Amino acid sequence: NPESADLRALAKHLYDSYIKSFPLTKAKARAILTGKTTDKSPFVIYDMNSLMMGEDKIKEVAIRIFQGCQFASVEAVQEITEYAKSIPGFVNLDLNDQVTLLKYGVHEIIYTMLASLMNKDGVLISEGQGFMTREFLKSLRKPFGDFMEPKFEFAVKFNALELDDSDLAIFIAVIILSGDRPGLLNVKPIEDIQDNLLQALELQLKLNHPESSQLFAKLLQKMTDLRQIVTEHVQLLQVIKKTETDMSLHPLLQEIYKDLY
């Protein structure tokens, strides 16, 4: 019908802008992770020695790996900011609200998109050029040992829903347009866009997974799970900042983390 049509157009437009915005999609990451591709398999990093050999193809070691994640996050935030600008009506909002939405959104979307790069065994890094084992990351000296295990725990549950790129494009758009972010000045227009996106996501989940039973409802439960993971992550960062003085926090990360949960 005509209301359906508009929601299908929005799903198509978000998907396009997702493909442009993000270098490594879930499709490629799956292809690389299965091995069922013609491309060169990724350099596996399972220990200190493998990490050192790995440097070429892609300070204490733990700190080296934390700075790695730091550079990667900053790139993710830039890709996600370009993607938010694609979300119809997002740029038309109050700039201070645009900032507030991204400020609380980016880490939730980073963890959502990290799952596409993850399996129970490890995570693809440097655009699938590397593959860092979960056991290796777990093994790091505290507090760095428990930095990524929560993201692995979430990713195995979230990966069960077998969402595809077209589902994810709308799902991340719905996360960005959250009306309950602290300090928003004009909630109504944000809620109006989220209502359009949520209907678009509902249709997309019925169409793309017609066999799937209340995928849309399970997916909305995961959004509340994501907030809890983003809080815990800020706690460890709060800890790491104070405990390690050899650690420099990237300015862009500082803007986001400043006055957050």
Binding site: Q98, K103, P251, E255
Partner: peptide
């Protein structure tokens, strides 16, 4: 949020 402002304005 000058960097965020900058990225949003770019």
């Amino acid at each position: 949020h000058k960097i965020l402002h900058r990225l949003l304005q770019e």
